[PDB]
Design an enzyme around this catalytic site. Structure first.
Site, PDB file in Angstrom:
ATOM      1  N   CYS A  34      24.044 -31.147  31.095  1.00 22.94           N
ATOM      2  CA  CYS A  34      24.606 -30.189  32.033  1.00 22.94           C
ATOM      3  C   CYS A  34      24.931 -28.902  31.292  1.00 22.94           C
ATOM      4  O   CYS A  34      25.681 -28.915  30.314  1.00 22.94           O
ATOM      5  CB  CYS A  34      25.860 -30.756  32.691  1.00 22.94           C
ATOM      6  SG  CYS A  34      26.672 -29.584  33.788  1.00 22.94           S
ATOM      7  N   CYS A  37      29.241 -28.203  31.930  1.00 25.49           N
ATOM      8  CA  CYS A  37      30.236 -29.076  31.318  1.00 25.49           C
ATOM      9  C   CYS A  37      29.749 -29.722  30.027  1.00 25.49           C
ATOM     10  O   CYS A  37      30.548 -30.362  29.334  1.00 25.49           O
ATOM     11  CB  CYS A  37      30.669 -30.172  32.304  1.00 25.49           C
ATOM     12  SG  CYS A  37      29.499 -31.530  32.475  1.00 25.49           S
ATOM     13  N   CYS A  54      27.877 -31.413  39.896  1.00 27.83           N
ATOM     14  CA  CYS A  54      28.649 -30.542  39.019  1.00 27.83           C
ATOM     15  C   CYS A  54      29.203 -29.348  39.782  1.00 27.83           C
ATOM     16  O   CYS A  54      28.461 -28.616  40.442  1.00 27.83           O
ATOM     17  CB  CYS A  54      27.791 -30.060  37.847  1.00 27.83           C
ATOM     18  SG  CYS A  54      28.760 -29.286  36.511  1.00 27.83           S
ATOM     19  N   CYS A 140      31.670 -22.336  12.212  1.00 24.03           N
ATOM     20  CA  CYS A 140      30.260 -22.468  12.530  1.00 24.03           C
ATOM     21  C   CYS A 140      29.892 -21.447  13.594  1.00 24.03           C
ATOM     22  O   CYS A 140      30.709 -21.110  14.455  1.00 24.03           O
ATOM     23  CB  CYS A 140      29.929 -23.877  13.030  1.00 24.03           C
ATOM     24  SG  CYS A 140      29.650 -25.084  11.724  1.00 24.03           S
ATOM     25  N   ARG A 149      17.641 -14.052  17.640  1.00 19.46           N
ATOM     26  CA  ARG A 149      16.984 -12.801  17.258  1.00 19.46           C
ATOM     27  C   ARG A 149      16.818 -11.862  18.450  1.00 19.46           C
ATOM     28  O   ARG A 149      15.786 -11.210  18.606  1.00 19.46           O
ATOM     29  CB  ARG A 149      15.632 -13.057  16.586  1.00 19.46           C
ATOM     30  CG  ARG A 149      15.674 -14.134  15.519  1.00 19.46           C
ATOM     31  CD  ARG A 149      14.281 -14.431  14.984  1.00 19.46           C
ATOM     32  NE  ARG A 149      14.306 -14.860  13.586  1.00 19.46           N
ATOM     33  CZ  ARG A 149      14.448 -14.038  12.548  1.00 19.46           C
ATOM     34  NH1 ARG A 149      14.580 -12.731  12.740  1.00 19.46           N
ATOM     35  NH2 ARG A 149      14.458 -14.523  11.311  1.00 19.46           N
ATOM     36  N   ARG A 150      17.840 -11.795  19.307  1.00 24.54           N
ATOM     37  CA  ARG A 150      17.810 -10.884  20.444  1.00 24.54           C
ATOM     38  C   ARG A 150      19.131 -10.155  20.657  1.00 24.54           C
ATOM     39  O   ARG A 150      19.288  -9.494  21.687  1.00 24.54           O
ATOM     40  CB  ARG A 150      17.407 -11.640  21.723  1.00 24.54           C
ATOM     41  CG  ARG A 150      15.967 -12.131  21.692  1.00 24.54           C
ATOM     42  CD  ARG A 150      15.758 -13.386  22.517  1.00 24.54           C
ATOM     43  NE  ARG A 150      14.444 -13.406  23.155  1.00 24.54           N
ATOM     44  CZ  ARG A 150      14.170 -14.030  24.298  1.00 24.54           C
ATOM     45  NH1 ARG A 150      15.120 -14.695  24.940  1.00 24.54           N
ATOM     46  NH2 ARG A 150      12.940 -13.994  24.796  1.00 24.54           N
ATOM     47  N   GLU A 174      32.721 -19.071   6.951  1.00 23.10           N
ATOM     48  CA  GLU A 174      32.638 -20.222   6.070  1.00 23.10           C
ATOM     49  C   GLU A 174      31.186 -20.417   5.623  1.00 23.10           C
ATOM     50  O   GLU A 174      30.245 -19.958   6.275  1.00 23.10           O
ATOM     51  CB  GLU A 174      33.184 -21.463   6.786  1.00 23.10           C
ATOM     52  CG  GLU A 174      33.211 -22.747   5.977  1.00 23.10           C
ATOM     53  CD  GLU A 174      33.823 -23.899   6.753  1.00 23.10           C
ATOM     54  OE1 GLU A 174      34.514 -23.637   7.762  1.00 23.10           O
ATOM     55  OE2 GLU A 174      33.605 -25.066   6.362  1.00 23.10           O
ATOM     56  N   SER A 178      23.579 -20.646   7.261  1.00 19.92           N
ATOM     57  CA  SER A 178      22.186 -21.004   7.511  1.00 19.92           C
ATOM     58  C   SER A 178      21.257 -19.855   7.134  1.00 19.92           C
ATOM     59  O   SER A 178      21.719 -18.744   6.851  1.00 19.92           O
ATOM     60  CB  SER A 178      21.993 -21.387   8.979  1.00 19.92           C
ATOM     61  OG  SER A 178      22.099 -20.245   9.810  1.00 19.92           O
TER      62      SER A 178
HETATM   63  C1  LIG Z   1      24.793 -15.918  12.783  1.00 18.69           C
HETATM   64  C2  LIG Z   1      23.576 -16.347  13.574  1.00 18.69           C
HETATM   65  C3  LIG Z   1      23.246 -17.686  13.653  1.00 18.69           C
HETATM   66  C4  LIG Z   1      22.135 -18.086  14.377  1.00 18.69           C
HETATM   67  N1  LIG Z   1      21.819 -19.461  14.436  1.00 18.69           N
HETATM   68  C5  LIG Z   1      22.204 -20.344  13.521  1.00 18.69           C
HETATM   69  C6  LIG Z   1      21.720 -21.566  13.898  1.00 18.69           C
HETATM   70  C7  LIG Z   1      21.022 -21.388  15.081  1.00 18.69           C
HETATM   71  N2  LIG Z   1      21.091 -20.071  15.402  1.00 18.69           N
HETATM   72  C8  LIG Z   1      21.349 -17.141  15.019  1.00 18.69           C
HETATM   73  C9  LIG Z   1      21.682 -15.800  14.938  1.00 18.69           C
HETATM   74  C10 LIG Z   1      20.843 -14.749  15.629  1.00 18.69           C
HETATM   75  O1  LIG Z   1      20.512 -14.890  16.788  1.00 18.69           O
HETATM   76  N3  LIG Z   1      20.452 -13.596  14.898  1.00 18.69           N
HETATM   77  N4  LIG Z   1      19.692 -12.604  15.481  1.00 18.69           N
HETATM   78  S1  LIG Z   1      20.441 -11.362  16.245  1.00 18.69           S
HETATM   79  O2  LIG Z   1      21.617 -11.788  16.950  1.00 18.69           O
HETATM   80  O3  LIG Z   1      19.642 -10.864  17.335  1.00 18.69           O
HETATM   81  C11 LIG Z   1      20.818 -10.100  15.063  1.00 18.69           C
HETATM   82  C12 LIG Z   1      20.233  -8.850  15.167  1.00 18.69           C
HETATM   83  C13 LIG Z   1      20.530  -7.867  14.237  1.00 18.69           C
HETATM   84  C14 LIG Z   1      21.414  -8.140  13.207  1.00 18.69           C
HETATM   85  C15 LIG Z   1      21.996  -9.391  13.099  1.00 18.69           C
HETATM   86  C16 LIG Z   1      21.699 -10.374  14.027  1.00 18.69           C
HETATM   87  C17 LIG Z   1      22.793 -15.402  14.214  1.00 18.69           C
HETATM   88  F1  LIG Z   1      23.108 -14.103  14.144  1.00 18.69           F
HETATM   89 ZN   LIG Z   2      28.424 -30.890  34.406  1.00 12.62          ZN
END
Ligand SMILES: Cc1cc(-n2cccn2)cc(C(=O)NNS(=O)(=O)c2ccccc2)c1F
Ligand SMILES: [Zn+2]
Ligand code: NA
Length: 268
Positions: A34, A37, A54, A140, A149-150, A174, A178
């Site tokens: 879901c 939730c 839901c 986290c 990446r958007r 922390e 990744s």
């Molecule tokens: C901290 C973080 C973690 C994860 N992630 C971790 C495990 C699964 N996902 C994804 C993104 C991300 O989406 N980065 N791209 S961004 O937001 O567009 C973007 C564009 C310009 C400059 C900085 C970022 C992220 F920032």
């Molecule tokens: Zn639900």
């Protein structure tokens, strides 16, 4: 046999890492969540039945941010135990180094959602220790793969630091971060530091942004914008060397901006 593929909202998403769902759920091919939730199910028929049952059309907790259809919800581990555990079980499918999914009471979670007519759809989240001794303003952070990446990820880093600005402290994520995370923080840091020097001691750049000096310094070393003199790091940059770097291709996509105007938060 582990969970390797989830269905959530209108997306199917392959798993990246092992997540400790109960062994009966693991042995399934697909897990069905879901999107409101975060209850997880073993069958499409239970999923389909829940979808008509839901009543949640948004995350729990308080809506502490809303500009346009971007929204952030504050959810306390203590007050929403089951939800936050499902959240961590979901996030563990894409975080290698997350180790904590059932002891949620010490944490508060910030859910990023994208709204339409049907409701507020989960994009990602970051967790945060109620009482962090190492001064970690993020535990986290996770963006769902079809949203990565958007802009949403950087938006969460910014949002993490604006709460740092409202508590009058500096904070650092922390570790270990990744791979997608390491590249997203350096980019955020770079963009914030560069556009503060186009517009200062390192200690000043540290209070104006709540970025730890180590993070400031290490980023300025990555830009080749810091000299060392008798054991001290000194910013050294000309307004031209800020502006080329600033207008280089990497900083061309229009981000989603945290408008502090629209942040209904107060420090504990
Ligand atoms: C901290 C973080 C973690 C994860 N992630 C971790 C495990 C699964 N996902 C994804 C993104 C991300 O989406 N980065 N791209 S961004 O937001 O567009 C973007 C564009 C310009 C400059 C900085 C970022 C992220 F920032
Ligand atoms: Zn639900
Ligand atoms: Na996928």
């Amino acid at each position: 046999k582990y969970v390797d593929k989830i269905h959530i909202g209108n997306y199917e998403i392959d798993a990246w890492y092992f997540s400790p769902f109960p062994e009966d759920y693991g042995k399934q091919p697909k897990l069905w969540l879901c999107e409101y939730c975060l209850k997880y199910m073993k069958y499409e028929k239970s999923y389909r039945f829940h979808l008509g049952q839901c009543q949640w059309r948004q995350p729990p907790g308080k809506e502490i941010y809303r500009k346009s259809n971007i929204s952030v919800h504050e959810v306390d581990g203590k007050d929403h135990k089951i939800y936050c555990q499902n959240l961590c079980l979901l996030a563990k499918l894409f975080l290698d180094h997350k180790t904590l999914y059932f002891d949620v009471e010490p944490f508060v979670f910030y859910i990023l959602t994208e709204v339409d007519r049907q409701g507020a759809h989960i994009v990602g989240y970051f967790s945060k220790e109620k009482e962090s001794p190492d001064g970690n303003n993020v535990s986290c952070i996770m963006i769902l793969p079809p949203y990565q990446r958007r802009g949403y990820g950087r938006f969460l880093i910014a949002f993490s630091y604006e709460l740092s600005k409202l508590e009058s402290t500096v904070g650092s994520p922390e570790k270990p971060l990744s791979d997608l995370g390491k590249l997203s923080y350096r980019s955020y840091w770079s963009s914030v530091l560069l556009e503060n020097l186009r517009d200062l001691s390192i200690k000043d750049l540290s209070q104006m942004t709540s970025i730890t000096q180590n993070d400031i310094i290490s980023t300025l070393q990555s830009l080749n914008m810091v000299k060392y003199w008798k054991g001290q790091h000194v910013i050294c940059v000309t307004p031209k060397l800020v502006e080329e770097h600033l207008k280089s291709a990497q900083y061309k996509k229009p981000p989603i901006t945290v408008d502090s105007v629209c942040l209904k938060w107060a420090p504990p």
